[PDB]
RNA sequence: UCUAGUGGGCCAUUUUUGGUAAGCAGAACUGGCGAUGCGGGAUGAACCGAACGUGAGGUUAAGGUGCCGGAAUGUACGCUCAUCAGACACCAGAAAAGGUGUUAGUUCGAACUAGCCCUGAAAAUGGAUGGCGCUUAAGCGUACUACCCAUACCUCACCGUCUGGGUUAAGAAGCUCAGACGAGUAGGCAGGCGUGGAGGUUUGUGACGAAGCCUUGGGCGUGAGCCUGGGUCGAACAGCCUCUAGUG
RNA sequence: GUACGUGAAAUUGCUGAAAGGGAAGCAUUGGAAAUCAGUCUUACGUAGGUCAGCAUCAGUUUUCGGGGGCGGAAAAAGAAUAAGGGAAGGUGGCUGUUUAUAGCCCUUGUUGUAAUACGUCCACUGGGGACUGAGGACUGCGGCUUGCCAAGGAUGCUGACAUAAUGGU
């Protein structure tokens, strides 16, 4: 929450989105369109990045179909160190390579994506535009 | 929000009156229904016509020909009070006959506690000559008119941080 | 039969069911459109602007 | 269809809280000046037929079954074809020997027992 | 199989063409009144428009403290409940009925939109003394088909134009059960419409009120 | 420490009520900076919550939350009507609520 | 518009009832309110009329144990709290909690003379009375009905005002320097397209 | 056709009689209260609005939106300053006549004429526009918007009642579909719950604990009630169909 | 244990818990604390507990926005531009006068099939929020192109927790 991210593609219901992992450390995730405030910031070129492989099956979790779960070893499992496929890491690095040059070219946007949105005293979101 | 209506009507023809006379009235009313009611009210007191034995032959809504021009209106009225023995002439300066009547109704209710039912408008005339003009209306007609802005109390904005300038 | 009442004004399928004419009805048609022949008699205007 | 209760609190008799001779069991107020009978605002409500529950979910336990009282094994076998409609409820006067026998009878039938433990 | 669909396909178009004819009649009548008024203005004479034959009455008062005569008349009008609406064929007999119950009801001249949306959104038929909604043309045909009223549009035409079978059409229509007006009434509801209230005759102003209740 | 607060501060004023009869099912909420019903239209459908603190640890948490949604504006001064999954306790009159920015449409 | 944790209100130039109505509503809203300079409050109407009103209030007392009857507080801050109390549901637990959230004081005591003091334009006399209308001051009304600390409140007030004036000159000297250094930075005119 | 209760009424609108007058006595017409909750008039049997099955949403009535109190310290134009102002119908009370008070009018400066204010106006526990308070109002007169909310209206779910339509493939005493409707004292009728005893019945329960009793356990029913876990206890008791009564 | 079967209530003492500023009791709604059942775990990719989020719809409703038809004095105005008339609350000029070194008022023509406002209508359309999901194979009335469909009442895609989490006392 509060992170600034770059929309890659619009999935069936949500948006496949990632703030460049080398900028703010937000990996490629689906985010429901009702939980985002779209900004009026200058657009980032996402035409050169492949978005066909980001599907519901790609982001799908492993099927469980049983009530047994939870363990300290279970939490020691998953994690970025384990679980996280090398292909997922490669895809994150590839989209980073295709996205960074645009935010490097347009000024102040790299660090804008690094920052975190927050409300301050006297701020009224209905009057404010993003 | 009153409106000026030209109401023309006549009683229905009979064997005694094959060709009845058409009578027209200019009267101010919020809508056409009240305008027809007041027309029958005035025609009933004068000239032996019910609503039943008469009919409204024409209804028209009159707008101000010059609504952007300041004018002086002299209004003669019949005022009915607790004593009810009164005629008045008042003058109101504004851009339309409808507004002058509205300002008359507010002023008459404020100063004499007279209601819409109690007041009947004898005639509304535009006074064109300055000499023909009420002292207050004349001294508004002063060519060199100038005066300071009167007090006007200037979202919720409670708990102001600074004392107001009010000047 | 008819377990739920559907408003034809809001349900275009129910409106299609009841009225097989809403398909071709053509609400907006330009009628007055050739000279706009202003029709007000001089005697009418004088009585209107009388008193 | 899940079970919905129009009302969950009991209809307690008026003034049963103040007098011990007056019990909680609901009695209709016949008094000429009774505030509760006249339905003054703030007084206790009275039982009405509008409070009745859905005919499909009436007499149903939260699990959807109806607790059918059971006193012997033959009473259990009456629920042979209605093990998804009724649940066996062993009576309080049944001894421990038949209580065990009814429990194994009901578990064989697949009939749930409300007071098995 | 296809014999039924073909025969009803024919029947449905008969409904369509009559609906087209009715709409053309509405447009022609509206144009004729406009042109006749324009001719009167141009020539300086006065054209008295046709007085309304159709009246819509809404019961604005509740069911308490009513004299027996007014209570009888409103029962004859089928205005049993507050905010109940009925279509009335206006004549001398009806005029003096509405005169008596004027403190308790309001009425005026309905327009085409008012009649159309009343019958579409609040349209219920009296089928075997039961309030059956008008969700199919079979319901209207099964009751008013002896008078060649086969469709909702036929019923609307009969009501709006006061046809020869207006009594049967009006009695077929259940008394409209209107909601409370969105936006409210005037400040005082039980004065006459002339003196700032909302009771009594209000002429064309019944249409805005009905659209508040629809 | 001013890098947070993705919500808007609001206060629970009272239940929805007549002069003498209260309706605890729906509440009256004053959102700060919301001064008219036109402004309340933006906050319609937002997710409002009451956050309070308890001694007992439910799932290892000292903080427990009652959620709700802004339903409609109330009056002319920007107050809104709010419906909660659990009716807010009457002791919260004057307490604070968090109005998130989601479900967002801006 | 926005609620602060504690709001300090300067009661100078304010009307008793209008300010009490605003304060009572804020207290019920869960906001902590401090009202200073209650002796500078105003009551619309000339002094003798308001003097008669308070003297009529003074008469209210039990025939048995006047020590049970209404207690008539002669201090301007206690007159203000009386108005707020009558505008609150103080017999109710909610109303009591609101009352302890109000601190009304004469003058500006040291916990509050170093804090910002807001005003309520809905209750300011200059905005709320027609010019030429007579009004009275609560402090004078208090002093001639029994309040006996009008002089000491005044004398302490000029000392506070003298110290406040010294503080202002020191702050204004700082603001003069920061303002002069403001336009020296070229960025001040660079960010002119942003409205700052 | 048979029968119950009733045969003390009361209030209001309007008309009206007796009366010095009366919260007085007497009638006429209607509406009410009695027998009736709810919204409102602070409070009240008849005033205003609206008449009531259990609920959800929406919208209104009367009345209100400074704070208590849900809702504009809204809009427009004036009037009023009151040395104990005024503030909403019923209603909880004041008149003639004046007042260098003031604001507007009428007719020949003079008189009148009106609206508000003051005077006339005057009691006994301390206290009442409901209170706080309110003065370009939060007072009064008029106009116009927005808003608040009743058990009323609208849509919907459910309960019951009544009514109508089906059902020889469905304890037909059953199943199914639809619509309208729902206040109630005195009183009438109907279907149910509970108690003691009798006939039949259930391969009925019981000293491995019947009946009874206690219970911050659970469950069912709109309800009368019913079942159950645990504790105590020690000899009998129950379901169903009918019979009966010293039956709540 | 004879003050003797069972041993109720009133009422009483002890213990634990809780509450309390001139009564108490009650009703409604939720909090807190204690207490507790159901459900689940399975059964056969399939279906399945509790609670949420979103999408696509249906019913009901509220709140904003755009486009168009039509009506009136076929708005009144006004702007721009040609005649004539009058003047001031008299401008330049010289208290008095008639557009000049400011202008205004009235009438007519024109631009014009002017625009807007208001009224009314669209079986024209774009949003946002709220409540509800009754029914349970098939039939019916319709639209589309036989399949499809928003058309005789909610399904789809998921996640968290499987918990005192929901729910009850």
């Amino acid at each position: 929450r509060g992170k600034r991210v770059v929309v890659l593609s619009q999935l069936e219901d949500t948006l496949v989105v990632t703030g460049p992992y080398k900028v703010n450390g937000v990996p490629i995730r689906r985010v429901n369109h009702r939980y985002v405030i779209a900004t009026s910031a200058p657009k980032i070129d996402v035409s050169g990045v492949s978005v066909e492989k980001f599907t519901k099956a790609y982001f799908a979790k492993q099927k469980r179909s049983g009530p047994v779960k939870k363990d300290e070893a279970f939490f020691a499992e998953n994690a970025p160190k384990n679980a996280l496929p090398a292909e997922r890491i490669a895809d994150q690095k590839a989209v980073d390579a295709k996205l960074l040059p645009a935010i490097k070219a347009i000024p102040n946007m790299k660090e804008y994506l690094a920052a975190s949105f927050a409300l301050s005293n006297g701020d009224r979101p209905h009057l404010m535009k993003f | 929000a009153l409106k000026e209506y030209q109401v023309v009507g006549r009683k229905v023809p009979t064997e005694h009156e094959p060709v009845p006379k058409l009578f027209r009235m200019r009267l101010f009313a919020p809508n056409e229904s009240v305008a027809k009611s007041r027309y029958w009210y005035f025609l009933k007191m004068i000239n032996k016509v019910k609503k039943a034995t008469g009919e409204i032959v024409a209804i028209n809504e009159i707008s101000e020909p010059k609504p952007l021009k300041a004018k002086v209106f002299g209004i003669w009225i019949r005022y009915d009070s607790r004593s009810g023995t009164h005629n008045m002439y008042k003058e109101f300066r504004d851009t339309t006959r409808v507004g002058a009547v509205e300002a008359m109704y507010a002023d008459m209710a404020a100063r004499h506690r007279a209601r819409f039912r109690s007041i009947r408008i004898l005639k509304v005339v535009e006074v064109e000559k300055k000499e023909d003009v009420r002292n207050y209306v004349k001294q508004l007609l002063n060519p060199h008119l100038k005066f300071p802005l009167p007090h006007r109390r200037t979202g919720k904005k409670v708990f102001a941080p600074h004392r107001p300038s009010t000047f | 039969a008819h377990v739920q009442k559907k408003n034809p004004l809001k349900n275009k399928a129910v409106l299609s069911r009841l009225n097989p004419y809403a398909k071709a009805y053509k609400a907006n048609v330009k009628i007055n459109s050739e000279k706009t022949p202003k029709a007000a008699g001089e005697k009418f205007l004088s009585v209107l602007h009388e008193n | 269809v899940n079970i919905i209760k129009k009302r969950t609190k009991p209809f307690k008799r008026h003034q049963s809280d103040r007098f011990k001779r007056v019990g909680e069991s609901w009695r209709k107020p016949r008094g000429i000046d009774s505030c509760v009978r006249r339905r003054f605002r703030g007084t206790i409500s009275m039982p009405k037929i509008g409070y009745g529950n859905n005919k499909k979910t009436r007499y149903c336990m939260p699990n959807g079954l109806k607790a059918f009282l059971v006193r012997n094994v033959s009473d259990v076998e009456l629920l042979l074809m209605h093990n998804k409609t009724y649940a066996a409820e062993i009576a309080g006067n049944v001894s421990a020997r038949k209580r065990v026998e009814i429990v194994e009878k009901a578990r064989a039938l697949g009939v749930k027992v409300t007071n098995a433990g | 199989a296809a014999e039924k669909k073909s025969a009803r396909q024919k029947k449905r178009e008969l409904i369509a063409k009559r609906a087209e004819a009715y709409e053309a009649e509405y447009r022609a009548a509206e144009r004729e009144q406009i042109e006749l008024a324009r001719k009167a203005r141009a020539e300086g004479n006065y054209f008295v428009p046709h007085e309304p034959k159709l009246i819509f009455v809404v019961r604005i008062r509740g069911i308490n403290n009513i004299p027996p005569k007014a209570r009888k008349i409103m029962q004859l009008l089928r205005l049993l409940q507050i905010n109940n609406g009925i279509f009335v064929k206006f004549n001398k007999a009806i005029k003096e009925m509405l005169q008596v119950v004027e403190p308790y009801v309001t009425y005026g001249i309905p327009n085409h939109k008012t009649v159309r949306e009343l019958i579409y959104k609040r349209g219920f038929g009296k089928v075997n003394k039961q309030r059956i909604p008008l969700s199919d043309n079979a319901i209207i045909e099964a009751a008013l088909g002896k008078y060649s009223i086969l469709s909702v549009e036929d019923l609307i035409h009969e009501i709006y134009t006061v046809g020869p079978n207006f009594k049967q059409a009006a009695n077929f229509l259940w008394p409209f059960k209107l909601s409370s007006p969105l936006g409210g009434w005037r400040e005082r509801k039980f004065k006459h419409f002339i003196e700032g209230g909302d009771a009594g005759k209000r002429d064309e102003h019944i249409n805005g009120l009905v659209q508040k209740m629809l | 420490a001013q890098g947070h607060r993705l919500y808007v501060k609001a206060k629970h004023l009272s239940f929805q009520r007549s002069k003498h009869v209260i309706h605890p099912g729906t509440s009256i909420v004053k959102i700060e900076g919301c001064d008219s019903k036109e402004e309340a239209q933006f906050y319609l459908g937002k997710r409002v919550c009451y956050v309070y603190k308890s001694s007992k640890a439910v799932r290892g948490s000292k903080i427990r939350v009652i959620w709700g949604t802004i339903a409609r504006p109330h009056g002319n001064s920007g107050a809104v009507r709010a419906r909660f999954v659990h009716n807010l306790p009457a002791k919260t009159f004057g307490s604070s609520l968090r109005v998130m920015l989601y479900p967002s449409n801006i | 518009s926005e609620f602060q944790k504690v709001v300090v209100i300067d009661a100078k130039g304010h009307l008793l009832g209008r300010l009490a109505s605003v304060v009572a509503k804020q207290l019920l809203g869960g906001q902590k309110v401090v009202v200073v300079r209650c002796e500078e409050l105003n009551i619309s109407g000339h002094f003798f009329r308001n003097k008669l009103k308070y003297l009529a209030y003074l008469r209210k007392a039990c025939r048995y144990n006047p020590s049970r009857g209404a207690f008539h507080f002669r201090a301007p801050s206690r007159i203000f709290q009386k108005a707020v109390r009558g505008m609150l549901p103080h017999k109710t637990a909610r109303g009591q909690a609101a009352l302890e959230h109000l601190q009304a004081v004469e003058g500006i005591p040291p916990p509050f003379d170093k804090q910002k003091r807001v005003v309520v334009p809905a209750a300011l006399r200059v905005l709320r009375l027609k010019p030429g209308r007579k009004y009275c001051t609560v402090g004078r009304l208090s002093s001639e009905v029994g309040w006996k600390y009008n002089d000491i409140v005044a004398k302490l007030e000029e000392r506070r005002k003298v110290k406040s004036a010294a503080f202002y000159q020191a702050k204004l000297a700082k603001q003069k320097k920061i303002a002069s250094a403001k336009e020296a930075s070229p960025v001040n005119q660079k960010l002119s397209q942003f409205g700052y």
Side-chain angles (χ1 to χ4, degrees), chain C residues 2 4-10 13-22 24-29 31-32 37-45 47, chain E residues 12-13 15-17 19-20 23-24 27 31 38-46 116-117 119-124 133-137 151-153:
Chain C
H2 184 78
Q4 203 190 40
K5 179 167 172 62
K6 299 184 183 288
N7 178 18
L9 314 169
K10 287 186 181 180
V14 183
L15 168 69
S16 147
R17 156 163 74 236
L18 275 71
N19 202 359
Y21 175 68
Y25 159 82
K26 320 173 305 251
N28 297 345
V29 286
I31 316 201
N32 23 101
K38 185 87 167 182
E42 265 335 286
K43 85 214 280 193
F44 177 87
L45 275 196
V47 186
Chain E
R12 197 163 174 77
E13 307 337 301
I15 285 166
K17 266 46 82 193
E20 195 209 2
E23 288 294 333
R27 282 180 225 271
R31 287 287 108 192
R38 280 168 174 177
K39 197 190 100 63
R41 304 197 310 263
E43 76 174 7
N45 298 288
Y46 303 114
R116 177 178 138 99
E117 316 209 1
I119 281 178
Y120 269 122
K121 183 179 187 292
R122 307 241 176 226
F124 295 76
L134 301 181
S135 75
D136 198 15
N137 284 328
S151 63
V152 178
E153 296 280 303

Side-chain angles (χ1 to χ4, degrees), chain D residues 20-48:
Chain D
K20 303 162 295 304
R21 70 201 183 219
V22 180
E24 263 165 0
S25 181
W26 165 255
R27 289 297 172 281
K28 179 73 170 297
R30 313 284 182 198
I32 67 171
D33 287 345
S34 186
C35 52
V36 310
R37 181 195 76 74
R38 295 198 272 161
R39 297 199 279 262
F40 275 143
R41 182 192 56 179
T43 56
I44 54 155
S45 167
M46 306 182 250
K48 293 175 182 180

Side-chain angles (χ1 to χ4, degrees), chain B residues 25-165:
Chain B
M25 287 213 36
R26 295 169 66 99
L27 39 74
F28 304 85
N31 52 10
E32 297 192 344
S33 301
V34 170
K36 294 162 183 170
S37 291
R38 305 305 290 167
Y39 178 86
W40 286 127
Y41 174 74
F42 294 124
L43 266 275
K44 196 172 97 155
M45 59 198 237
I46 62 170
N47 205 2
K48 188 62 67 69
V49 191
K50 281 181 180 291
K51 175 170 168 306
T53 165
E55 60 177 14
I56 294 304
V57 69
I59 208 64
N60 290 86
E61 204 264 334
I62 319 180
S63 269
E64 190 73 26
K66 300 287 96 175
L68 282 170
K69 186 187 60 178
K71 287 157 292 194
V72 172
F73 296 107
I75 307 174
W76 295 261
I77 55 131
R78 261 177 62 153
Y79 165 63
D80 166 293
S81 179
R82 282 76 170 273
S83 63
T85 299
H86 311 303
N87 287 292
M88 251 159 281
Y89 172 72
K90 287 178 178 287
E91 286 191 350
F92 312 84
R93 175 170 160 80
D94 52 351
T95 42
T96 175
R97 298 172 52 95
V98 176
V101 170
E102 281 170 35
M104 182 270 294
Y105 269 127
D107 185 74
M108 264 306 297
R111 293 192 194 278
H112 302 112
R113 320 304 175 154
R115 283 92 167 100
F116 182 88
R117 64 185 190 222
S118 281
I119 307 158
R120 67 186 74 189
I121 297 152
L122 263 53
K123 186 173 209 334
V124 175
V125 176
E126 189 188 325
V127 179
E128 293 179 353
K129 309 246 208 103
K130 175 177 167 68
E131 48 178 14
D132 290 4
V133 169
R134 290 319 162 187
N135 193 359
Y136 43 98
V137 184
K138 273 186 173 178
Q139 63 85 30
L140 307 186
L141 288 197
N142 188 359
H144 296 316
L145 200 31
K146 55 183 287 296
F147 48 88
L149 199 58
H151 191 260
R152 46 175 263 155
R153 295 276 165 79
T154 292
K156 305 290 100 173
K157 315 176 71 67
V158 75
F159 294 145
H162 300 288
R163 198 65 61 102
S165 74

Side-chain angles (χ1 to χ4, degrees), chain E residues 58 83 122 178-182 185 209-214:
Chain E
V58 184
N83 301 325
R122 307 241 176 226
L178 307 168
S179 184
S180 297
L182 173 74
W185 296 89
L209 190 66
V210 169
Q211 289 162 27
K212 291 169 172 196
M213 311 219 210
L214 293 174

Side-chain angles (χ1 to χ4, degrees), chain D residues 79-101:
Chain D
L79 294 195
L80 164 73
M81 299 261 294
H82 317 88
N83 71 277
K84 302 278 154 233
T85 311
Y86 302 88
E89 185 186 7
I90 307 168
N93 47 17
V94 180
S95 293
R97 299 179 280 181
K98 274 188 217 353
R99 194 167 297 276
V100 176
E101 280 206 344

